[model samples]
Target: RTADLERARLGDDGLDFQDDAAQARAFAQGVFLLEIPEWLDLSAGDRFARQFFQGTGVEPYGKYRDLSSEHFGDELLGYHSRVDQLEQFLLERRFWGEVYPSEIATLGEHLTLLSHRVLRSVLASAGIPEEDWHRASGGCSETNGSYHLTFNHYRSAHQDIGLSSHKDDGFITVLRTTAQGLEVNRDDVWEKVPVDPACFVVNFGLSMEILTSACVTPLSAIMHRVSHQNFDRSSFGHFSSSRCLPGADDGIYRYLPSAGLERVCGSRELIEENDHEIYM
Candidate 1:
């Protein structure tokens, strides 16, 4: 593994970096829908009966209730945010007893680990450094990692506006939803992101676009939102990447290449202009 310089090389059965990256950008699709079906082993049964929800008053997509766990923390409780109203959440491979049933938390960690594995496979295929991938992926260190979860409930549906469209800001985001509500702007049309119990829709974040610049052309972050489905829509999203992000307008773009300094990377005036988000 570490002994070989070609450690990160993905010979076959690997994603073709540049091509896939290009197609995604041109088609204006923000994410890659991946299927890893045998997830039944990850605690997907009826673990939290009505007691967990009705008892806590934080049902599936309880209004604005939210819970987060800093996976990088060193205690039974790492941190909490915006969820003062609800007594639920997960952290450090455990759930806040009163917050979640054991199985639900395990499911979260399982999904997270699977997400890391998938990205690792991608990075390795592209010849990106192994150490770099793990560290940035929130899988191998305390200094660099990821955390947080959102239990979003769509109260009603209307065409005027769903949740305002916005761009994500990490290397990649992993999302799981029990009900369908997510939508992405496609050709000026708001398209519903079809949901699948066996898959995760991965949208590329700005950081990832910048990291693979030399090999995988930067993918422009796409605008997306939630549909106003007048039902109880429930979902969860996990953001993962290196512990830190580079300044959008800083010389950070020059991480490894620059004009007249080295090689690769085509020059384009549009790069800077399109680096940020254009909300709808």
Candidate 2:
């Protein structure tokens, strides 16, 4: 609703993947409203949201299961799972394709490939060789690297802030939401991100900023905050985490939080509680 805000779309005038350098430069500064993948079943996303929310109560270890007692409509219910462990979680529960819609698992696969595609382009634009980038450890993929998927159910919302101002700790984040309230800071002003059912919001993360620090136009992670509205909202976030290798000295290695410090960057539980912050 704010006229001051201008969200960047992937195929917009100055933003196109084919022009890797231009796209990379624009991506570093603002949030991108990307068209959903053609293979995506729009209807399936809604269905997955409903079923996933309903099934969270069945697991005793689930993050949101115990929150039922509070009944606070303004609370943000979240469920976190790593992609590598997703199969085991679903298999152990025997809930694949039924209890927890198979579409949910498929969504992870699609996001992984999408993450790889975007990262590859970003790396190339920075004049960084692919072999030098992902050789220390695998980048985001279906079975390699760190891929974290989080399901967020913003139960009936009020005016309170659903999320505080902070930069995402991963390499990149692909977000799909059913409603609005996402606001990103640009030019020192917070602007609401438009919500479109068919578009996904792509934003840079701290890891990206660190990795591209030496580039002519280094990427900057978007600082964002979510202000809840009166309507309910459901969103899915897929994060491609930076690989923390065994031993490394400089470049991306020196900036990794896990390298020398005990502080881990992207623990969902810690981030939820506002106990963790990304170390530059």
Candidate 3:
């Protein structure tokens, strides 16, 4: 059954979101791999990852932080912010008072726009009312929804799992790993998710499931994990979520659980200790 997921690509024309049958399959599977858009430049993210990994005792800036701990099989450098503020935060570069490459800010802007457009299309296909969509969508391009861009370095030759099994907390996540070791749990069996250089793995998270709870075939958050291999591995992911606007009615923000509220309202300094919360 997991093999069927291979056909869940958005394809060249990006027709999956519009085709009724394809849309149904997309919501049912809750995850798919999509080709990297031709216009987006990945070199910025790649260079940043290499730069972060090379230096010892280097701290990250703004919403970006080092999330390395002895308990996990990988080291992480993560950045979290609302879509509209991503470029601003990255451009500030206050960590070591050193200027990060300009490409980072530009990339952040493009990625943020991409995530918003993709999420909006998916919501529209689900028949969410335009009025509700406007408020729920983080407000017309000035997306207040929380976003996460993470860099993961999986340890080499380790006997343990690089990442423990769990479902993501946001609405959707787009990721690309340099190598294959990612496995998705389907029907209690672990199925390997292959590495497609041309594609980014796009998956629905818990919030998406919550948001589309009433759909014909409700979305399901895919539970996944990563394994350690004989060689080092790297991956990058961008996560998007629907946020509870400040001073807004709680009833309208049904997608966000209590954990998400704390994340949106709480201080980043105190929340850094719980790596899970950063991603959540």
Candidate 4:
């Protein structure tokens, strides 16, 4: 059952390796895809399918938006969500922006649970130390963290230019997408990550790169880039992270959903409000 804990520490900008890195190497060695129904409950897979359908359908603000950035040739639409601690969500004071819909927030609980379960399992399988493994997991355990859910829609046929090359900035990033635009920089070339709707993709971030330095020599983050696809591509990105650093005693700093797509696409603005869109 889920319980309560402080939303807290994750490490800051990570440094390089001090020993032979296992987890880092593991991360670099392969692309891990999760079987949603297998790893998580069937309800999660079914629920998200429905949510993604409705979410992306939202026109201007109901959890969907068009990044279609002129900078990127206006080639994208997106769905974003942040899962809160299920039990203590309503009793909280405030997150970075404002309040969100208790309904969607309700559904988030299931995904949040699924995210944490995967985080721990991935670390363990990657050969991270048991203590270190659990420590990192603690950062986002039961009721102590926030998991991000993002669904990206890339619609570019020729000149397939997806998101610019970059690595995730959190402890771990778990994703599953439709079509193939996601690419990982291997050796020196960008290789396309195979698409599997029933599976999830896992990659470690900066914080993990640092925390595992003591074990994995040359601990490294998985650098990846997305390219243009022949058809519209949709992906769900779920990130597991704490409000604070691994050992820090501070709060989480983040922009809310209501803040709108300005920060997202940089082309649109947050002009209207709804109970689900507007926050407290």
Q: What TM-score quantifies how close candidate 2 is to the native fold?
A: 0.67
Clash number for candidate 3: 0
Evaluated at residue 144, the lDDT of candidate 4 is 61
1-280 in candidate 2: lDDT tens per residue?
Answer: 4413223333323235434554644566646766776667656545444345445554322323333312432122233221111110111111223333466656676776776666665566666644556632134422355565556555553345465577876567878876767888887888888777777788877667756555566778889866654666656677776443223211132122223312234333323343244211
Candidate 1 has an lDDT of 0.44
lDDT of 4 by residue, 79-141 (tens): 222121000011111221243344444445555666666556445544554554434543563
The per-prediction CA RMSD against the true structure, in angstroms, equals 10.3, 8.5, 8.2, 14.1
Q: Candidate 4: global Cα-lDDT?
A: 0.43
Worst window of 10 by summed lDDT in candidate 3: 84-93
Instruction: Order candidates by lDDT, high to low.
Output: 3, 2, 1, 4
Over the stretch 1-280, how does candidate 3's per-residue lDDT look in tens digits? 2334543444444434445676667657777766677777887676465445444455342223332322222122233221111111112111112333456656655666666666766776766665666554444224666555555655554455567676776676878665778888877888888777777787877666656665554678888877555666666677665433223322223333222211232212212333364234
Q: Which stretches of candidate 2 lie over 4 Å from their true place?
A: 1-25, 54-100, 135-138, 141-143, 157-159, 243-275, 278-280
By TM-score, highest first, what's the ranking?
3, 2, 1, 4
- Extract clashing residue pairs from model 1: 157-228
TM-score of each: 0.58, 0.67, 0.69, 0.54
Worst 10-residue lDDT window, candidate 4 = 84-93
Best by lDDT: 3
Q: Which candidate is the best by TM-score?
A: 3
**Which residue pairs collide in model 2, if any?**
none
